[PDB]
Design a protein. Structure first.
Lengths: 395, 395
């Protein structure tokens, strides 16, 4: 009477510690009941490998916790998928990327940054890159023990000290006296739940402006940088415009637009704050996207720096009509609507096996016997993916 | 009988210390002898400020040495120009940027680097951004002083340790024994000729791989990194990308051809060498420009980071005919021929005064009274500019 459809799809990304283990649910409905088959990135199918992979009731695939000696790449680093099929057809769920991370020691360091008196200084906590995605900066702590980043999910921007949403610590108006203060960043492993203070203690090395200098970027000997950053909706972006000069310069921010060589000034309102040489955007919407330009000027000259912004939006899919009934030889239309950002590509599948059709909507001239089954619109960007399905019957 | 011309013109950038002082000289020929004035590109002419500037016996501009206190911004950091004048017309030299920097104290540091065993590690000597224009890495060395290598002195690419043109220290396939050793850099301020050792010592902190890891960037996110570099012709550039993973990934360097995104593989000849994940080009040329790419695939997955190179050639220009003799009413013009790279803009001037024409041909539909005089074609870009002079005479 009805084909298979996923009631609950597995999530895009599952990251878990060897100590933690993991569980992934897949359930689809229809009649007569669909099977539930776990499938690898390519094809074939999923077996149980005791102590590592098991399938429980409800059709849930579980990875129990394991000791480091038992780690296997083809198991733990693999990208999986769920398959549900009945007599009417088959449907594959969205791609499920599984990465297990065996618990290991690591140390976080806050290195010093060099700055001229006044202006603004910014200190970053240096986190090993390979662990970088599993660890986030929570707060910062000075010699007297003050927590600058520990209050609220949003920080007051009008004070001397501000902990940026990027985890980085921003300081307005560096004085000669504050150089005697040292700071430590606290990090927390999202899986283990362990918190640890930074190993080394960072400090500000302050150079006295005994002579004037143009704006100087972080690069050396003709080195510029274009930082392309992405942040999800409702989150908070931070745009960096690192510089040092004397006399202390002023930072004017601008925004390019689609296919333009020009720009316009940026709105400074309560939604989007600016602080010194750094711009913060709270409650990021999708329209905050597009090429941004920071320009630093003073009496002796000026320079600009480019940073581009793309706001991630959750992908989705809907096929219409969900269930279609068409005669023999008569065409039928499946249009796939979707919501999200960005979208790199869109695929199509018939009964679990993929077609080469790259367009959002697809057509069929004359309905034949082979044209009955389950179809799916696969929309995937580089970082994610999502899908829906539809049924077609003959009459 | 003849108009003004420069047989000697200053170089664009002149940098010097408070103790060193500096001189810049122009000279002019023609007939009768054109008078030589030193005028700010700001539009005003400068005279003799005692001890902080003056003019010597012949035509030249000299900045004497001075103690730190006597530093004045309006003199020591300024754009200047050289101007020749006679009854025929006027001409100006290229914009000369004079930058004086008083001797002061600074320190460099070598921060620790985090690396997965088997991967190549790159240690950086961190120097203040504002002294970056001057100081450059000379050599590295052991805890006891043993040199790992000296920058700019000869080479070889196949050894464990190699110091790159950028000044960084590269280590191939880091291992357990390396963790016990310290890496320590010496730098040289080229204006003061003084070399000092970094205040701190960097140490390699090695993590032992257990589970597999996709290729990881130096950024966490959400912030990948573009790098815009560039280098002088027949210099030595260095490309880069900071991949950290297990198992050790392989690096295939490609190059975006002109225009469209079509990729092309990079050749490794006796000149161009690739060690681990870092490409090098010795004796660079302008044709080496264009967007580059290094794709790092791994057993688990793959990722790509981009860099765009531009190699500069010295700027010059020549205007023909050197001197036109135009009859009354006939269109007569100078075309601007030149060589160099890059060129962002080109402008013109009528006997010292700016018009605002753009493309390098000036054509007027016919001559008049005022048209008689001097003309110049000024090619300009970020780092420098050059010029040429020409005349017409009504008849
Ligand atoms: C996930 O993997 C980690 C590996 O880092 C497991 O933690 C490790 O557990 C072993 C025990 O099997 C610890 O080794 C022990 O160390 C003590 C000295 O502290 C020694 O006396 C014992 O004989 C034994 O060798 C190891 O230190 C520990 N490492 C860390 C970083 O915690 C963890 O148990 C695994 N999760 C599981 C099995 O659920
Ligand atoms: C603040 O400083 C920036 C320097 O980064 C200034 O931007 C620069 O402005 C100059 C003119 O003021 C531009 O020069 C012009 O360029 C066009 C080509 O686009 C050329 O045809 C003109 O003849 C002229 O030379 C320069 O391109 C521009 N550079 C950048 C990177 O923006 C900015 O104007 C300064 N703002 C203020 C208010 O002074
Ligand atoms: C350019 O500026 C520098 C820095 O201001 C000048 O060098 C400095 O000279 C002073 C001497 O007036 C040095 O101070 C000290 O002198 C006492 C003796 O009274 C001595 O015991 C100390 O050991 C120290 O030398 C200062 O160290 C020195 N600093 C540097 C960086 O060189 C320099 O003289 C100026 N150039 C000219 C041409 O005057
Ligand atoms: C190396 O890594 C890349 C990822 O950057 C793999 O996938 C390519 O990804 C781009 C999108 O950035 C696609 O346009 C390409 O079509 C992908 N490659 C292919 C072959 O389809 C790439 O496949 C990896 N290569 C190897 C040999 O593993």
């Amino acid at each position: 009477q009805k084909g298979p459809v996923f009631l609950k799809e597995p999530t895009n990304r599952i990251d878990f510690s060897n100590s933690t283990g993991a569980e992934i649910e897949c359930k689809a409905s229809g009649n007569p009941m669909p099977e539930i088959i776990w499938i690898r990135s390519d094809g074939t199918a999923v077996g149980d490998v005791p102590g590592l992979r098991q399938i429980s009731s409800d059709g849930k695939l579980v990875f129990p916790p394991f000791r480091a000696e038992d780690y296997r790449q083809e198991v733990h680093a693999q990208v999986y998928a769920c398959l549900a099929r009945n007599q009417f057809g088959s449907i594959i769920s969205r791609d499920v990327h599984v990465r297990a991370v065996v618990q290991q020691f690591y140390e976080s360091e806050v290195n010093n940054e060099y700055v001229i008196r006044g202006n603004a200084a910014v200190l970053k906590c240096s986190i090993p890159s390979f662990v970088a995605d599993f660890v986030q900066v929570v707060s910062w702590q000075d010699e007297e023990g003050q927590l600058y980043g520990s209050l609220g999910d949003q920080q007051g921007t009008d004070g001397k000290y501000l902990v940026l949403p990027s985890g980085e610590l921003h300081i307005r108006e560096v004085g000669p006296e504050d150089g005697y203060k040292s700071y430590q960043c606290r990090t927390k492993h999202r899986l283990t739940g362990e918190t640890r203070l930074s190993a080394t203690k960072g400090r500000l090395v302050i150079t006295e402006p005994v002579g004037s200098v143009s704006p100087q970027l972080s690069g050396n000997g003709n080195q510029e940088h274009i930082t392309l950053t992405r942040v999800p909706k409702m989150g908070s972006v931070t745009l960096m415009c690192p510089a040092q000069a004397y006399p202390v310069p002023f930072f004017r921010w601008y925004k390019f637009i689609e296919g333009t060589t020009r720009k316009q000034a940026v709105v400074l309102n309560d939604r989007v704050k600016q602080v010194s040489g750094t711009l913060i955007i709270k409650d990021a919407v999708v329209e905050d996207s597009g090429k941004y330009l920071c320009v630093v000027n003073n009496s002796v000259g000026g320079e600009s720096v480019e940073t581009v912004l793309t706001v991630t939006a959750p992908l989705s899919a809907k096929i219409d009509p969900p269930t279609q009934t068409v005669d023999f030889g008569r065409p039928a239309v499946f249009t796939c609507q979707y919501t999200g950002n960005p979208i790199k590509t869109v695929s199509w599948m018939k009964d679990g096996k993929a077609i080469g059709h790259s367009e959002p909507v697809l057509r069929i001239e004359s309905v034949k016997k082979e044209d009955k089954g389950m179809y799916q619109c696969f929309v995937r960007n580089d970082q994610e993916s999502a899908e829906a399905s539809a049924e077609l019957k003959l009459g």
